[PDB]
Amino acid sequence: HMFELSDVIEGKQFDREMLSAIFDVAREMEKIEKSSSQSEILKGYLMATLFYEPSTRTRLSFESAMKRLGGEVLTTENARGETLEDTIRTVEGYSDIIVMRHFESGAARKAAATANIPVINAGDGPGEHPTQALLDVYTIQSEIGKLDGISVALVGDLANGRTVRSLAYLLAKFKDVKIYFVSPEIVKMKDDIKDYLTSSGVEWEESSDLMEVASKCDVVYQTRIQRERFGERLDLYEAARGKFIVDKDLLGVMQKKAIIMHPLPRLDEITADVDADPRAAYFRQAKNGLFIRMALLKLLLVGW
Amino acid sequence: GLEVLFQGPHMFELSDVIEGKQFDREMLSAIFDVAREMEKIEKSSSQSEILKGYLMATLFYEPSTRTRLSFESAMKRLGGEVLTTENAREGETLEDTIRTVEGYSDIIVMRHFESGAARKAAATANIPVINAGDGPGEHPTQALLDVYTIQSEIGKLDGISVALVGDLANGRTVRSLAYLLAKFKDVKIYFVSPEIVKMKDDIKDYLTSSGVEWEESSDLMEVASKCDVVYQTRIQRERFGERLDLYEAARGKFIVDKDLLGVMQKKAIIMHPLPRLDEITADVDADPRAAYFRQAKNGLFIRMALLKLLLVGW
Amino acid sequence: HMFELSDVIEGKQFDREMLSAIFDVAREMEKIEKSSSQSEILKGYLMATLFYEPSTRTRLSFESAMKRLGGEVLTTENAREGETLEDTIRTVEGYSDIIVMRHFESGAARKAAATANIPVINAGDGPGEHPTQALLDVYTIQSEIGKLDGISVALVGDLANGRTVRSLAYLLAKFKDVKIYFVSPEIVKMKDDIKDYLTSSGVEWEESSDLMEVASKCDVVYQTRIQRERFGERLDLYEAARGKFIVDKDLLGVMQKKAIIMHPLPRLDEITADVDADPRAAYFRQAKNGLFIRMALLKLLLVGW
Numbered sequence A: 001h002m003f004e005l006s007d008v009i010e011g012k013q014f015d016r017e018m019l020s021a022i023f024d025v026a027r028e029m030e031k032i033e034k035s036s037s038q039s040e041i042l043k044g045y046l047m048a049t050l051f052y053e054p055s056t057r058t059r060l061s062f063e064s065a066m067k068r069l070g071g072e073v074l075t076t077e078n079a080r081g082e083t084l085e086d087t088i089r090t091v092e093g094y095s096d097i098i099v100m101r102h103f104e105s106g107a108a109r110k111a112a113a114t115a116n117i118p119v120i121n122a123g124d125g126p127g128e129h130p131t132q133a134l135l136d137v138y139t140i141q142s143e144i145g146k147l148d149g150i151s152v153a154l155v156g157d158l159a160n161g162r163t164v165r166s167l168a169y170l171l172a173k174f175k176d177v178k179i180y181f182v183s184p185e186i187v188k189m190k191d192d193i194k195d196y197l198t199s200s201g202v203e204w205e206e207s208s209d210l211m212e213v214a215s216k217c218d219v220v221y222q223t224r225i226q227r228e229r230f231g232e233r234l235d236l237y238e239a240a241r242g243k244f245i246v247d248k249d250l251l252g253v254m255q256k257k258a259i260i261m262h263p264l265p266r267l268d269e270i271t272a273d274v275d276a277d278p279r280a281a282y283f284r285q286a287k288n289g290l291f292i293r294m295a296l297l298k299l300l301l302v303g304w
Numbered sequence B: 001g002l003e004v005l006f007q008g009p010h011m012f013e014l015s016d017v018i019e020g021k022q023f024d025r026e027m028l029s030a031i032f033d034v035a036r037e038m039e040k041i042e043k044s045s046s047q048s049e050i051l052k053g054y055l056m057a058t059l060f061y062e063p064s065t066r067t068r069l070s071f072e073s074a075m076k077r078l079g080g081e082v083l084t085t086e087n088a089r090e091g092e093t094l095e096d097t098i099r100t101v102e103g104y105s106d107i108i109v110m111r112h113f114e115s116g117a118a119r120k121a122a123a124t125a126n127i128p129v130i131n132a133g134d135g136p137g138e139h140p141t142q143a144l145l146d147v148y149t150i151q152s153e154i155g156k157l158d159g160i161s162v163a164l165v166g167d168l169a170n171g172r173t174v175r176s177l178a179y180l181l182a183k184f185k186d187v188k189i190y191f192v193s194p195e196i197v198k199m200k201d202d203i204k205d206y207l208t209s210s211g212v213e214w215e216e217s218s219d220l221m222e223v224a225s226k227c228d229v230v231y232q233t234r235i236q237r238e239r240f241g242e243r244l245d246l247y248e249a250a251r252g253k254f255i256v257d258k259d260l261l262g263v264m265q266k267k268a269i270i271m272h273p274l275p276r277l278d279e280i281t282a283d284v285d286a287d288p289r290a291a292y293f294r295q296a297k298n299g300l301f302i303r304m305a306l307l308k309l310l311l312v313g314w
Numbered sequence C: 001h002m003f004e005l006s007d008v009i010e011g012k013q014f015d016r017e018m019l020s021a022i023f024d025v026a027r028e029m030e031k032i033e034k035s036s037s038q039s040e041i042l043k044g045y046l047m048a049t050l051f052y053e054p055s056t057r058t059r060l061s062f063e064s065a066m067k068r069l070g071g072e073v074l075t076t077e078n079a080r081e082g083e084t085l086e087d088t089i090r091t092v093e094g095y096s097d098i099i100v101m102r103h104f105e106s107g108a109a110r111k112a113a114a115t116a117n118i119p120v121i122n123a124g125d126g127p128g129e130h131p132t133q134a135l136l137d138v139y140t141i142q143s144e145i146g147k148l149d150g151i152s153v154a155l156v157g158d159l160a161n162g163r164t165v166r167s168l169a170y171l172l173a174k175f176k177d178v179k180i181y182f183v184s185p186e187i188v189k190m191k192d193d194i195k196d197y198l199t200s201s202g203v204e205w206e207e208s209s210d211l212m213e214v215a216s217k218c219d220v221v222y223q224t225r226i227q228r229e230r231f232g233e234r235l236d237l238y239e240a241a242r243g244k245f246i247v248d249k250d251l252l253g254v255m256q257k258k259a260i261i262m263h264p265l266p267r268l269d270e271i272t273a274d275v276d277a278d279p280r281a282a283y284f285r286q287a288k289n290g291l292f293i294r295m296a297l298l299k300l301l302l303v304g305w
Helices: A016-034 A056-068 A084-091 A107-114 A130-144 A162-171 A191-199 A210-214 A234-240 A248-253 A282-302 B025-043 B065-077 B094-104 B117-124 B140-154 B172-181 B201-209 B220-224 B244-250 B258-262 B292-311 C016-034 C056-068 C085-095 C108-115 C131-145 C163-172 C192-200 C211-215 C235-241 C283-303
Strands: A046-051 A072-076 A097-102 A119-124 A151-155 A178-182 A203-207 A219-221 A259-261 B055-060 B081-085 B107-112 B129-134 B161-165 B188-192 B213-217 B229-231 B269-271 C046-051 C072-074 C098-103 C120-125 C152-156 C179-183 C204-208 C220-223 C260-262
Touching: A016 A130, A016 A282, A046 A056, A046 A084, A046 B065, A056 A072, A056 A097, A056 A119, A056 A282, A056 C046, A056 C072, A056 C085, A072 B065, A084 A097, A084 A107, A084 B065, A084 B292, A097 A107, A097 A282, A107 A119, A119 A130, A119 A282, A130 A162, A130 A219, A130 A259, A130 A282, A151 A162, A151 A210, A162 A191, A178 A210, A191 A203, A203 A210, A210 A248, A259 A282, A282 C085, B025 B065, B025 B140, B025 B292, B055 B065, B055 B094, B055 C056, B065 B081, B065 B107, B065 B129, B065 B292, B081 C056, B094 B107, B094 B117, B094 C056, B094 C283, B107 B117, B107 B292, B117 B129, B129 B140, B129 B292, B140 B172, B140 B229, B140 B269, B140 B292, B161 B172, B161 B220, B172 B201, B188 B220, B201 B213, B213 B220, B220 B258, B269 B292, C016 C056, C016 C131, C016 C283, C046 C056, C046 C085, C056 C072, C056 C098, C056 C120, C056 C283, C085 C098, C085 C108, C098 C108, C098 C283, C108 C120, C120 C131, C120 C283, C131 C163, C131 C220, C131 C260, C131 C283, C152 C163, C152 C211, C163 C192, C179 C211, C192 C204, C204 C211, C260 C283
Parallel strands: A046 A072, A046 A097, A097 A119, A151 A178, A151 A219, A178 A203, A219 A259, B055 B081, B055 B107, B107 B129, B161 B188, B161 B229, B188 B213, B229 B269, C046 C072, C046 C098, C098 C120, C152 C179, C152 C220, C179 C204, C220 C260
Antiparallel strands: none
16 A cells, blocks of 8 residues: 555545554554664655754754665755755755755645655644644544543643643544643633634643643643743743742642653753653653654555 | 666765866766765665765865755765864864864865865865865866756756856856856857846856857846746845946846746756845746755755765766 | 673773773774675664764764674764653653663763663763773774783873873773873873872882873873963963873874774874874874774664674
8 A cells, every 4th residue: 555645744634544544554563663674664765854953862863764774865954045945856856765954834835736756744833743743642542542532631732832732633533532721821722723623523621730731631841931922021930930840749639650751852841750650651652752753754656 | 877787986076166177078978977866865764874984074164054955965874974063163274173173083074155165175185075165266066066957957958048047257157057058969058147247258168178068148038938947046236336326227027937937848957056036036936947945855866976086886 | 791881980980801802893894894894783773862962973983883794874963952861761762672872961971871771882971981982092002012011191171180091091090001101281180090090900100291201101192282261370381281281293203013003083283293103193093993993882772793
């Protein structure tokens, strides 16, 4: 069979049935990485890596995905004049798949249209990051075992957080989900997501009491609250500070089967001695990105 | 492309790719012959291993994502591997850098911002060196893939008319191309430019010494109709200097657009070395005579053929 | 036989026997690089380069090493960008099988080695330990001279603050009947810790400012630069030093036939260009030897002896 998506660009390309299929493939890719013999699935295929905004973690995730499958890479750490449409039409002559990260929203769409070859969005500015939401939902399926009938908290900057929005969207494709929105009032989630969730059958609750929510949740997804979002209201920052941190006291209330997650990078919103608890899943999360992006590379080049 | 009476090695020597004069017709025939075989190899679906075991070192002091990936791809399409360095700018001098890097690799592809560095590396190294662009100096792989594209699209190089448009005084690309088209028979060259940036007398001389016919014109529209090839390059506004009156007059008169394509022959082609801003309109892209992206992909086949000739021979 | 070391962080890890044993591995890696059939020893292994402080020379050394052995590389020339290195290393180790890192800040190689459950090689700890430089230096001496016991080595240049002369001196002392001339302006003479170490190590050392007299007594002349920065305000001591610590045609004229000139590079006018033509100029051979030492370390840490 051949893959049903010609590119990987945005979250709305995915439906529940697809996501389950992709995660099955990702567990095949995990069995490959752990093997001791070098796979040749993608032998002969080249990947161009175009990172107009550089993220070392995310690139090497992708490059490592290509080489763990037997492919090779035409790596470009910056790439930051000429049109993007010209850059893509030229690069596709030297490669078979393109993984781009831009500083401008809309860049992935332009490229996928221009390109005759698969294009994967590794970060379209302030816009969508689909591989990040895919690894986040696969990480939940993997840590908790189920995606139906789960409770997830989304903590931090929800108004302007691009990772929590893209994730909520994808979680909505499953049954019996409840989502908590733990944040200060000034960075609470925006109404297009809330309405999307009510429409999709998702029960949701707003709160400022992280301590109360973590005790009831199957998952705690942490994101930093930047000071910039508080602007002039520094009294609201003062109050907010220290109330939305994952620390040893927060793990006390959490259920033994719950987990802490994080898109990374993280500062002091998660403390170091959380890393000891097996429930801290943000590093297996990052590893899980290797497996998911292996599946996409595989499916986009040689189908199911 | 003709009929081979001898299947053994060629009589030329080729240990570095540094400057146009290197290339006689025999080397153009050899390089173009091999390039057409690499085209087969790239389109082929089984990974080649001609340059298995070889390591290319990629030193781009003047970063160019387009040129570098072309060379890196070419190497990896022939089964070689690449130690890449996108931005090699930082000073320890170049010869210390080359003599060290040559220990770590089998071939070096340098692109400098300063002229004469390609020649310094070629002499300092005891491995092959390819000039990916010597700053304001030679860019030979570009000139090679320009000529190879004309033959590829138009079928021939003898008896063609070629328009060179844009900054001809300071155009690094167009001068190299004119020098390499001069080596053929019955070629006519049109220098389409404003007076401020017309071609320098040292090129106009060489084309007269070597019998090539050339004509000047600031009326691109008239020339476009009489040509096999329109080779567009941008005119930077900085070249006019204080004469902003002359910039106003030139503005809009050297631009490839759908209007220009109308008056153009059906078998002629549009070429651009890239990058291109607004001197070629985006709606020209759809027309099959817009060969600037096929021109770029040609860079891959020509750069694979060079790697091959340099590391394994015939 | 697995490799006795789990990371290559500092010099104090090495003893006389480990060094000689590792050097033999390098002479094997020399035969592999000269071979025409591509090696596959490290096939299926991925190296992650992490150069916060860019060094095109040092990086390619390591990358070429991995690929000559059949491994592959996840390159990053400039890793400087605000998360913690510990967080960064843990993530990377998910994507790789060995991490080679160069940092600008002292103490980072220690951090990375402790965090990762895969091997780490220190390519430069900022101003701290640069162990694979000290290793390729000693191996180049053994290679050109033929032995490390009973040699005379002159360390020339900024001795007070130069980490390379100190790290080379550290490893050379592990051998028998060595002598070291500290050639340098008086204000940048070698610090007491190293002198006490050499004395306690059974090593003879002699301070001098006369590079011409020392040169004729030496098997090796290890040249480094003396940045004007090091004199601080004593530009009189910089003018007095100028011209007197240079390796030039005149100096080559007083040195033994089987002596050599070494330099870790980058080198400016402290070695003149007509010195490269002489066969005793070993600094470019020295750099090539880094390929072999670095192949040997990659190979040992990942599959062992």
